Design a protein around this ligand. Structure first.
Ligand SMILES: Nc1ncnc2c1ncn2[C@@H]1O[C@H](COP(=O)(O)OP(=O)(O)O)[C@@H](O)[C@H]1O
Ligand SMILES: Nc1ncnc2c1ncn2[C@@H]1O[C@H](COP(=O)(O)OP(=O)(O)O)[C@@H](O)[C@H]1O
Ligand SMILES: *C1=CC(=O)N(CCOCCOCCN2C(=O)C=C(*)C2=O)C1=O
Ligand SMILES: *C1=CC(=O)N(CCOCCOCCN2C(=O)C=C(*)C2=O)C1=O
Ligand SMILES: [Mg+2]
Ligand SMILES: [Mg+2]
Ligand SMILES: [Mg+2]
Ligand SMILES: [Mg+2]
Ligand code: NA
Ligand code: NA
Lengths: 10, 411, 411, 10, 10, 10
């Protein structure tokens, strides 16, 4: 879980 | 001296780490929705408490096999039968009625044919059993579902309707739970009017108080309206003292940037003697977001001084305040639900992590919902898009690319 | 004569087609959460109603360019300025303060350096403007956000906190909305005791009343507790008449199968003169689910006679009752949200469409949540798994395969 | 939209 | 099958 | 790369 948005690797 | 820019990750974990869990109280079970159990709950009875038919039909001796049987009476819901079934006999049963002594299986009415009834047609006398019952068939033995002494709900359970039903089932009508936070909300600014007011020169209506109180109420917490406070330290201190007296949590908006009459951080620190854990956050929107704790006589009060800009106020309320309130009311993992969605539009990334209200929509046989940033006019926002900070690699995201969305609405 | 088996699709569309939309009422805006607007809402003022600074800094003449400027005064939040900025002059401004006559841009304080203040250090006198402002920079003109006469919310909008904030902004404190349904709930059966009761021989506690009332309350609708009614037609008719008098919607459970003392369909038809639209549904669970309407003096009452089995009662309440209530309170598309999830376990398919409560969980960087059928003990059900009917092609579904899940919980 | 569950073709 | 390239809708 | 077949985790 992270409160900062992430990029999707799939 | 401006406060240091705190990272979004550090600001978030600081809120959850520093927020207290409230104490406990006993409530009536019917008031349990959204509450968290602070005790394990045990069954004091078996369910079912008698051997119970699964079906409308007949209580038989399986060893009798198929054939023509004398009906000696009926076991009806709510009555303990008095008769014993002997070889060659059956008793009519309905779903949930007790199994008479001497019967060890139930045959459902569809596996029977009625031969003889009364001239009145009021009582069945003889039935043909068409099947070989397995012993125990279509019976719930005593304690099948719940055993006397069994723990049916553990401490830490966040209750919904099925948990309230289970408390009713076991007759545990009073339960220990965590208290809900009482949340006081004030607006700040010499420019603000009440929603009920006609405008006057240089003034606008206060929206943040309404939007923040509604956000908190939506989550089921009690609130206190502390009104509009002017841009002056004496009034702000008086209003904070009232919040501290009447509530567990104080939310302010406005007065937290570096403008001349932005006074909240000075009052919290110098006048109220609260501990400001962060006073700026590297996030968009929400740069001046401020979190403080005040420890009085072994009680920790929580203060969120949110930014004045209305969009900033509602976004930061969703990111920081709601998770804090979930921890205070006892939810073990109070973090919000994060889902994956497809962006409906290209977006330029900021160096700050960026957040924007959106509507999530699921399309026909598409695994991922689409996130549309704020007939879509007819739906309230149910997501907060969580955009990653720009890097040398990623400067922009495109329509269809997969992003994190925090749930803030029922889907 | 048993009622025909109605398909799940026909039963569902019959409920939505035959359910009425309630009338309208005026409410205070603060009571608007979950309500649907029955009127368009217009702004009677501009937002902002004066030209407003975006920044803390100085109101300048862009044509003056960069250089050293006399500060003739301050525009503070909530006050209409009296002075006119002439070439060579500026006025201090804060965010949201009005732009004085003669200024056409704002320069943020970061793009300035202070030269001279008062000996008291109380007033700024001269500032160096380091940038060339674009005319209009960092100003919200009158009506930038909202124009007087603009429709800000359309009829049919299902309101959340941001819509309440917008009503506060525009000073529309009273709005026409659809009424919420009043929902009366009764349990049936000679075997039932209240949750508060100790058990007696042959009896169990009533759970369905609690679970159904909590389900309806969770959605924000007012309820009426009609208690436990025995298995006899006179008492059932009296209790239905009371429901019809006090409520818009009557929910019963039990007494709808083909058992000897299952009386509800006879009472609804023969005694109450309601129109039973369906009395059996080809679904698992929920075979005896019954839906009826009763038209009295141009009012349509809604009656759901749910199955007695507690799991059946809560599943059918979620499938049929909640969407009906959403249509009654004015939601234009009252259908539930359906998402795609991955099955956590293999499942054998039934010839009937099958439904089961589950918990949806999103894992790290996985696009689809997992659905786990009822630390997972600490979470309430938030989904209803919707399994397809078995076909010659599909007889079973496997772990990881993608299924439909109806949202019934906040995620 | 359908109230009866469907199989996934992708 | 098409000899001209197509965009992907999933 | 592996010459022995693997199960798919996505
Ligand atoms: N309110 C309730 N709470 C708990 N169990 C119930 C309730 N109402 C009925 N049941 C049980 O559900 C089963 C089915 O009841 P019944 O009245 O025969 O339902 P139906 O005829 O609609 O199938 C029985 O075991 C009955 O005791
Ligand atoms: N309660 C409120 N409702 C609507 N607008 C508000 C409210 N409080 C502040 N604002 C506006 O938000 C902007 C920022 O206000 P300010 O008090 O300077 O916030 P901060 O200093 O925390 O950034 C100004 O335009 C102000 O008028
Ligand atoms: C994924 C499955 C699915 O049905 N949809 C909706 C669009 O359906 C169009 C595609 O049907 C099958 C062929 N197909 C694609 O076009 C893309 C993947 C794929 O299998 C989905 O989005
Ligand atoms: C899909 C993307 C993703 O990150 N996960 C979680 C598991 O991540 C393991 C795979 O990382 C990249 C390689 N990969 C797979 O193993 C499966 C697809 C794929 O790209 C997802 O489930
Ligand atoms: Mg202010
Ligand atoms: Mg400010
Ligand atoms: Mg019954
Ligand atoms: Mg029955
Ligand atoms: Na801000
Ligand atoms: Na049933």
């Amino acid at each position: 879980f992270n409160i900062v948005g992430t990029t999707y690797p799939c | 001296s401006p406060f240091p820019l705190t990272s979004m990750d550090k600001a978030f974990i600081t809120v959850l780490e520093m927020t207290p869990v409230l104490g406990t109280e006993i409530i009536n079970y019917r008031d349990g929705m959204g509450r968290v159990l602070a005790q394990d709950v045990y069954a004091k009875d078996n369910l079912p408490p008698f051997p119970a038919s699964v079906k409308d039909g007949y209580a038989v001796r399986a060893a009798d096999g198929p054939g023509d049987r004398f009906i000696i009476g009926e076991s009806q819901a709510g009555e303990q039968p008095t008769q014993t079934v002997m070889p060659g006999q059956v008793m009519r049963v309905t779903t949930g009625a007790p199994i008479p002594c001497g019967a060890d299986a139930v045959v459902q009415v569809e596996d029977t044919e009625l031969i003889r009834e009364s001239d009145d047609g009021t009582e069945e006398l003889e039935v043909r059993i068409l099947v070989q019952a397995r012993p125990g068939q279509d019976i719930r033995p005593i304690g099948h579902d719940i055993k006397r002494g069994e723990c049916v709900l553990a401490k830490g359970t966040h209750m919904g309707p099925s948990e309230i039903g289970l408390l009713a089932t076991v007759g545990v009508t009073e339960v220990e739970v965590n208290k809900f936070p009482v949340v006081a909300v004030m607006s700040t600014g010499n420019e603000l009017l009440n929603p009920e007011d006609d405008l006057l020169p240089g003034k606008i209506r206060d929206s943040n108080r309404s939007t923040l109180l509604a956000t908190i109420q939506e989550h089921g917490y009690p609130t206190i309206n502390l009104g509009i406070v002017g841009d002056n330290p004496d009034d702000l201190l008086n209003a904070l003292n009232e919040g501290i007296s009447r509530a567990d949590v104080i939310i302010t908006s406005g007065g937290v940037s570096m403008g001349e009459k932005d006074y909240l951080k000075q009052v919290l620190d110098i006048d109220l003697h609260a501990q400001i854990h962060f006073g700026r956050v590297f996030m968009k929107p929400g740069l001046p977001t401020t979190f403080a704790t005040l420890d009085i006589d072994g009680v920790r009060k929580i203060i969120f001084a949110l930014p004045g800009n209305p969009v900033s106020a509602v976004v930061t309320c969703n990111l920081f305040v709601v998770p804090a309130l979930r921890k205070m009311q006892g939810i073990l993992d109070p973090r919000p639900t994060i889902i994956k969605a497809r962006l409906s539009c290209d977006v330029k990334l900021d160096p700050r992590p960026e957040y924007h209200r959106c509507i999530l929509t699921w399309h026909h046989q598409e695994p991922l919902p689409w996130a549309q940033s704020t007939l879509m006019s007819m739906r309230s926002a149910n997501g907060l898009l969580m955009l990653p900070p720009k890097t040398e690699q990623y400067v922009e995201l495109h329509k269809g690319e997969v992003v994190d969305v925090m749930v803030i609405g029922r889907l």
